From a paper:
In the barley β-d-glucan glucohydrolase, a glycoside hydrolase family 3 (GH3) enzyme, the Trp286/Trp434 clamp ensures β-d-glucosides binding, which is fundamental for substrate hydrolysis during plant growth and development. HvExoI folds into a two-domain structure consisting of an (α/β)8 barrel (domain 1) and an (α/β)6 sandwich (domain 2) with a 13 Å-deep active site pocket embracing the subsites −1 and +1, positioned at the interface between the two domains. HvExoI catalyses the hydrolytic removal of nonreducing glucose (Glc) moiety from a broad spectrum of poly- and oligomeric β-d-glucosides. The crucial role of substrate binding in HvExoI implies a pair of the aromatic Trp286 and Trp434 residues that form a clamp at the +1 subsite, which is positioned next to a pocket-shaped site at the −1 subsite, housing the Asp285 and Glu491 catalysts.
G4SG-OMe bound to native and WT recombinant HvExoI with the Ki values of 1.0 ×10−3 M. The β-d-glucopyranose rings of thio-saccharide analogues at the −1 subsites in the WT crystal structure complexes were engaged in H-bond networks and observed in the 4C1 conformation for G2SG-OMe and G6SG-OMe, the 4H3 conformation for 4NP-G3SG, and the 4E/4H3 conformations for G4SG4OG, while the β-d-glucopyranose moieties of thio-ligands at the +1 subsites adopted the 4C1 conformation. In these WT complexes, the Glc moiety at the −1 subsite was oriented almost identically, contrary to the Glc moiety at the +1 subsite that adopted various orientations. The complex with G4OG3OG was generated based on the WT HvExoI:G4SG4OG complex, upon replacing G4 with G3.
Residue numbers in the entry: -3 to 602
The structure:
């Protein structure tokens, strides 16, 4: 179809399957194994990418071209890597992936949305779809084509350090929030076949349903550990949202570090091939987690040859190496040359990776669009995040007795008010993990509005706002305050650092709430990724709001505190009385919550 050097795979008018087949039939083994290899930007160079025919790059958490880098700097990085891939014999574009899990969260000046637990509180799948839409734009602002989201874990024990990444303990809520996928990727057409991958084009990103499967089921919420549950319960709790993701054309699936009844997921042929591929008919590509094949063995990394064999034979398509790429390629090449891994398995992996690349338009638009840089941090997206933050808030108490005046909503005009607590003026704490750094960080780490700044923006000009991080009781009682807003809670964490058997917030937190509430009527805003021991905070407070990890737009908190909007959020998880109850979910015999799933008080807008 027409010039003498026509190559069908380069013809954008041709069907995806024809282009895939045409390309695959041209590739050497080294080209094929290169497609299967994802490396960290930190080990990438132009020569590395060309010589090893690399298929994909990622930024792990905190892996950035420099601190404070602009959108244009990200595009220039990504395009520099792409130029090297495009210079190979076959010119196959790389796909660049990142954890854009509550916005484009590694990037300075990106809108940071509430973490998933708060989004579960909203019970609003359309809101979540819009968040997906905005997030795709902000990822494409930085030149990135692929986001490692959504996390569709159903967290069954809040002692898990990734509980905040789960929309709920109730899989129906998780299933509903799979609407993130067509936000990020675009809506699938009416005719669509479930399990096929889909991305609408260059203003959308490939998505990733993660982590397959039972990541939120692990014993004692120990991260990466064993999920002990029969097949009926795996299928009833942990699996259903994967079906919803297939119906919405999710492009990729990332495998869990966890084990199901003692078998590592990264080595689980029955589930990865037998179930996801052969029963759900998934036709996108399956990616490992970070050194996930290494962690098949104990100790991790102790037989990388076996890790390669076991994972590829299990049915993984792309391996997030992410550093030891020479070793990886060398080992897989030797297994193929030895007949230990059949070429059919290699060709299936490559078919899937190429299918996603062609489908999304990556061959037509391999490079960044500089006109998209202005999407990063856009005020429209911030307004969305502010709506989401406000809808996520769950009002747990609004008066000490049944006869007291409701504290909330607070009046915006008062002579003098106090804002206090470790979390009142700390943007990093309000965002939590996966924000700028992998683990999150403390203080003013990006562009956003703290609780204190939001109060100052909201109140009448005649209201004097005093900030004291940790005032003593006598300071509050002598201060002449009309009321206080006190914000306290968890510090940022991710993954294993967040695994926590006591679930008691750090001090000073409770001591500050007791000092403040002791001197003036107080509204306590609890910042956490999960339920935490709360009876003492409740005892001290006139009003208490569970604000989860609301992100960069702290005006979402004050929009409810001052009554511009009513409180509508409802608990997406059970709030335990004691950590000795755990795990404790609905249907259990010992179900005795402090607050049940679905609990939340309301107010009306003033
Ligand atoms: O990010 C891609 C997928 O990765 C894991 S999280 C992953 C972080 O992205 C990464 O920065 C981090 O690196 C640490 C290594 O694990 C350690 O071996 C060394 S000692 O220290 C570095 C410090 O950064 O590793 C993390 C996993 O351990 C998630 O599970 C996926 O959801 C995510 O999409
Ligand atoms: C399946 C799995 O990953 N299990 C591990 C096991 O090594 C260890 O005994 C346990 C307690 O550390 O936590 C985890
Ligand atoms: C009062 C108490 O024991 N707090 C601990 C804390 O120090 C530790 O960081 C956390 C995470 O494991 O578990 C809890
Ligand atoms: C907390 C509160 O005042 N809630 C009120 C509710 O009692 C009332 O029924 C409703 C009428 O629309 O408006 C709201």
């Amino acid at each position: 179809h027409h010039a003498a050097d026509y190559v069908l795979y380069k013809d954008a008018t041709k069907p995806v399957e024809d282009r895939v087949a045409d390309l695959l039939g041209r590739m050497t083994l080294a080209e094929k194994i290169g497609q299967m290899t994802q490396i960290e930007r930190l080990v990438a160079t132009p020569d590395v990418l060309r010589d090893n025919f690399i298929g994909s790059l990622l930024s792990g958490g905190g892996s950035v071209p420099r601190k404070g880098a602009t959108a244009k700097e990200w595009q220039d990085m990504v395009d520099g890597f792409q130029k090297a891939c495009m210079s190979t014999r076959l010119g196959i574009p790389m796909i660049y992936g990142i954890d854009a899990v509550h916005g484009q969260n590694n990037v300075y000046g990106a809108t940071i949305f509430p973490h998933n637990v708060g989004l579960g509180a909203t019970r609003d799948p359309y809101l979540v779809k819009r968040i997906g839409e905005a997030t795709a734009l902000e990822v494409r602002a930085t030149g990135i084509q692929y986001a490692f989201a959504p996390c569709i874990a159903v967290c069954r024990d809040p002692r898990w350090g990734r509980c905040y990444e789960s929309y709920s303990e109730d899989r129906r809520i998780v299933q509903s929030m799979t609407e993130l996928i067509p936000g990020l990727q675009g809506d699938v057409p009416k005719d669509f076949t479930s399990g096929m991958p889909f991305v609408a084009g260059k203003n959308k990103v490939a998505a990733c349903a993660k982590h397959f499967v039972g990541d939120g089921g692990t014993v004692d919420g120990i991260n990466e550990n064993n999920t002990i549950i029969n097949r009926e319960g795996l299928m009833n709790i942990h699996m259903p949202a994967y079906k919803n993701a297939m119906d919405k054309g999710v492009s990729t699936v990332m495998i869990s570090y966890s084990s199901w009844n003692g078998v590592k997921m990264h080595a689980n042929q029955d589930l990865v091939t037998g179930y996801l591929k052969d029963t759900l008919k998934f036709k996108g590509f399956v990616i490992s987690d970070w050194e996930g094949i290494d962690r098949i063995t104990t100790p991790a990394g102790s037989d990388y040859s076996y890790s390669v064999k076991a994972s590829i034979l299990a049915g993984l398509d792309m391996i997030m190496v992410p550093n030891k790429y020479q070793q990886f390629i060398s080992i897989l090449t030797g297994h193929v040359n030895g007949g230990v891994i059949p070429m059919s398995r290699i060709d299936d992996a490559v078919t899937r990776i190429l299918r996603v690349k062609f489908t999304m338009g990556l061959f037509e638009n391999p490079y960044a669009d500089p006109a998209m840089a202005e999407q990063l941090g856009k005020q429209e997206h911030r307004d969305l995040a502010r709506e989401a933050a406000r809808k996520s808030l769950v009002l747990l108490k609004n008066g000490k007795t049944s006869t007291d005046a409701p504290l909330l909503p607070l009046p915006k005009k008062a002579p003098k008010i106090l804002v206090a607590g470790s979390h009142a003026d700390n943007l990093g704490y309000q965002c939590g993990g996966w924000t700028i750094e992998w683990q999150g960080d403390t203080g003013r780490t990006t562009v956003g509005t703290t609780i204190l700044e939001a109060v100052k923006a909201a109140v009448d000009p005649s209201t004097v706002v005093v900030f004291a991080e940790n005032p003593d009781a006598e300071f509050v009682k002598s201060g002449g305050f009309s009321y206080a807003i006190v914000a306290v809670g968890e510090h940022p964490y991710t993954e294993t650092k967040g695994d926590n058997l006591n679930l008691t917030i750090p001090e000073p937190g409770l001591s500050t709430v007791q000092a403040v509430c002791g001197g003036v009527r107080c509204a306590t805003v609890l910042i956490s990724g999960r339920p935490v021991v709360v009876q003492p905070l409740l005892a001290a407070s006139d009003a208490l709001v569970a604000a989860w990890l609301p992100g960069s737009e702290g005006q979402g908190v004050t929009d409810a505190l001052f009554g511009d909007f009513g409180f509508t959020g409802r608990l997406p998880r059970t709030w335990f009385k004691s950590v000795d109850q755990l795990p404790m979910n609905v249907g259990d015999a010992h179900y005795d919550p402090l607050f049940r799933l679905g609990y939340g008080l309301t107010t009306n807008a003033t």
